[PDB]
Amino acid sequence: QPTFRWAVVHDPSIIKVGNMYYVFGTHLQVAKSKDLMHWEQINTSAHDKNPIIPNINEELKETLSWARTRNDIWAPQVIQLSDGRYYMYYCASTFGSPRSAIGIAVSDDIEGPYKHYAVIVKSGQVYSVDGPSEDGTPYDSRKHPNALDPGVFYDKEGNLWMVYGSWFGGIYILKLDPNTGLPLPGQGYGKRLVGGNHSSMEGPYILYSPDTDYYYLFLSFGGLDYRGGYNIRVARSKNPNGPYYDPEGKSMENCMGSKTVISNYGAKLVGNFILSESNTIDFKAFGYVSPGHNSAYYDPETGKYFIFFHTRFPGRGETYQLRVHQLFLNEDGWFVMAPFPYGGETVSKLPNEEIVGEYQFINHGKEITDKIKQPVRIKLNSDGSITGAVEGRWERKEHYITLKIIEGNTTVIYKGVLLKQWHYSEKKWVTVFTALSNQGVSVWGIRVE
Ligand SMILES: [Ca+2]
Incomplete structure (x- = not known):
């Protein structure tokens, strides 16, 4: 009986507005749903005439100029702050580079149009022209983060935080002013949570669970491409700003280095699979390649949890879709992912x-x-x-x-x-x-x- 219609949204960030779920993603891919299974695409690219951020090159001239790019923004997340407005945290960059900026745009309506609000974090400063990094020392892409992949959330006490980062210096967290969305002064890049020295991690997202009273830090390890081994990792902390620990008790502040090394850390939720005994490419069979860059939601009306992610597919190269699955908490307070996409299922005793x-x-x-x-x-x-x-x-x-x-x-x-x-x-x-x-x-x- 359940049916589906996915959307094409890379790096999806969930927000619920009224009875409608939205995801915002890279390239201003945006989609919406009432039931989490059928998605209406409302935007597909950051072209000059898109309705989300019209004339983006002029509107976001500050961040785009910094990143030396045009007609694109990456990993936007919209969050409603206390004034009721919708704040789009996003980043501007170019492939492979640490020359990046985190910006904020703002709208009165979820679907836009969003206007420039602030430029909050920059990386990739060239000292002879731009001067220092955000911490007052020369930018050094081993130590300092790439100003990418904002993950913004309120803590249980009402404080506002942004976790961020991709490769390069690692994954950092900044405390924000709940009244303005801006980082509180004097933090530099903030506190390092995971990574450093070019470790293969990105897309950090933090979710609070009322059911366990822990914060859960979600990361993607590896490369996003077909051959990249993208996979979703989980750690948890009683504090929004850590330290985060994995199920073995390892501290994620110690997670850094080569792919082999960082693989030792975190709860790996999913990697590449196919439900075929026959072959590794079987278009009839359910399977994912490089599932990652996720967000997550707790629904207080039902007590269910969901993960929102994109994925590629066995034998289909770089083609990707949004997928949504339910998450459950095991008897030890760790998340386990439902094998299949969400079809309305409610756990009960079998x-x-x-x-x-x-x-x-x-x-x-x-x-x-x-x-x-x-x-x-x-x-x-x-x-x-x-x-x-x-x-x-x-x-x-x-x-x-x-x-x-x-x-x-x-x-x-x-x-x-x-x-x-x-x-x-x-x-x-x-x-x-x-x-x-x-x-x-x-x-x-x-x-x-
Ligand atoms: Ca994100």
């Missing part, structure tokens, strides 16, 4: 008869890889045993599942949730599980019915 059976099983691992992971077959048996491709034991308590799986010479415990979801490709309701270990590895199970 009886045993709906749990027992053969599953396709995907282990997403811990690495940053472009490998398209495929499933193996396992069975969850009535006696609590796991058999097939892996051995172990499973148990459940309400909708919380625990899987204890033998991996080499050790048992790894995965904790997650069980529910019924809409099988996106098979078009039927099926049992699924999604679970996470303390080493930050996600597993998905999709019941063969």
Whole structure:
């Protein structure tokens, strides 16, 4: 019964306005929805006649001039501040460069037109012409962030923050004045949360959970392209400005260096996969390549959580869509992602008869890889045993599942949730599980019915 119509929105940032969900993305790709499943595209590029920011080159002359670019802005996020106006935080840049700026535009109406408000953070200063970086020292792209990818959020106390960054100096957070949206004076680039020295991370987003009273920091590791191994990582903190820690207890301030090294940190939520045993490219089969650059939302009306992200697809190169999935909290207060896109599903306790059976099983691992992971077959048996491709034991308590799986010479415990979801490709309701270990590895199970 559920149906879908996606949008084409790269780097999507969610905002709810009235009964309508909007996503704002790179190139001023904008779309909206009442149900999270059918999306109406309202803008597709930052051309001179777009209605979101008309005549953008003149309107945002300050940031675009800085970035030496035209007809484009990257990773915009709109947030409603206390005056009721809509503030679009965005960045201007060029591919591969740290010559970037974070700006703010403002509108009275969600769909615009937005006008210039402020220029707030700059990177890529060339000392002989521009002078120092924001911290008063010469810009050094190993230490200083790239002024990209703003993630703005209120904390539980009403303070306003912006987490930001992409590669280069890492991921930083600035405290903002709730009344103006501007960074409070005297912070330079702010506090470093993750990364440094050109570590492959970007798109930071922070979400508060009332259900656990933690803040969750979402990052994308790797490259966004087909061969980049883009993957979504999660850490959490009792404080909006950290330190953030992963499920193993590692501090994300220590996450920096090579791809192999940074891969050791964070809960990896999803990487590349396809639900085909046949082949790694199978256009009938559900699968993603380079899912990332996400935002997230908590809906107080229902208590559900959602992740908004773009992704590419097996065998389809750089083509991408918006996708929306539900997130759940496991018994340890960590997020686990629903295998399939959101079709209206609400978790509840399943009886045993709906749990027992053969599953396709995907282990997403811990690495940053472009490998398209495929499933193996396992069975969850009535006696609590796991058999097939892996051995172990499973148990459940309400909708919380625990899987204890033998991996080499050790048992790894995965904790997650069980529910019924809409099988996106098979078009039927099926049992699924999604679970996470303390080493930050996600597993998905999709019941063969
Ligand atoms: Ca973002």
